[PDB]
């Protein structure tokens, strides 16, 4: 009953957990770049790199270091695209490869209210009125923001650019899925243009998990 597969093709392996494995180490390579960092960042940095080595194996790519580039995505493999996320009580990845997909974001976190103040900084006037709407029972404002991180980690491989906050307006279903509208020039660096993100989302085990898959386009 993992969260990350229920919410992404079978095609792209994930793998997550729950809590850190004790004695994990992360790679020679990726040292550096958590050197800096204190304990808790190092400990989700490893275990979420342990996770996405399981899935790129699936994929047959032996031990492989992850490292990052200055605007922090993660640098995966010729022909891989993934993403990662984690959260207290979680850490996840999953992997694609790019003749089968374009871009992949998830992202996961706890169900519950937003902190003090960041839905004010998150979500444009008519998304507050937009969940006001939604069915009781779900913390839809938590589920924006989540979504909205996805949004940023599905783009930024198809794009170098930042996407802010105010930049797309996602709208949430009931049923599971939700839409992102890119509010900016969505000019992407395979020469297309990304105006709107299908994304597909579960709450379970006190965790929200969003997701984005964007597809490839039929032959032209
Ligand atoms: O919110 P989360 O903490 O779950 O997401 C952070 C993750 O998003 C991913 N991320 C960060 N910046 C990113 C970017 N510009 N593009 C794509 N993914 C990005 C990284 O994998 C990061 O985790 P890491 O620093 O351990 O690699
Ligand atoms: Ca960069
Ligand atoms: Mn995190
Ligand atoms: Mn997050």
Known sequence: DQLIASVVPELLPSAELYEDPPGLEPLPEE????????????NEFITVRYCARQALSVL??????????????P???????GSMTHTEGFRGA????????????IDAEPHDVLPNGVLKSIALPVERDELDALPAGTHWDRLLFCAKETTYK???????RWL?????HITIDPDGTFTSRILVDGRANDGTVLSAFDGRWIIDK???????????????
Not at 31 to 42: H, M, N, T
Not at 164 to 168: I, L
């Open 31 to 42: 040292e550096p770049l958590i050197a800096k960092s204190v304990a808790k960042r190092r």
């Open 60 to 73: 047959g790519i032996p031990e492989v270091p992850i490292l990052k580039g200055d605007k922090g995505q």
């Open 75 to 81: 640098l995966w493999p010729d022909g891989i695209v």
């Open 94 to 105: 999953v992997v694609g490869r790019t003749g089968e997909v374009r871009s992949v974001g």
């Open 154 to 160: 599905a783009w930024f491989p198809l794009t170098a």
């Open 164 to 168: 802010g906050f105010e930049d797309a």
């Open 206 to 220: 006190g965790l929200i998990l969003t997701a984005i898959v964007v597809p490839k386009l039929a032959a032209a």
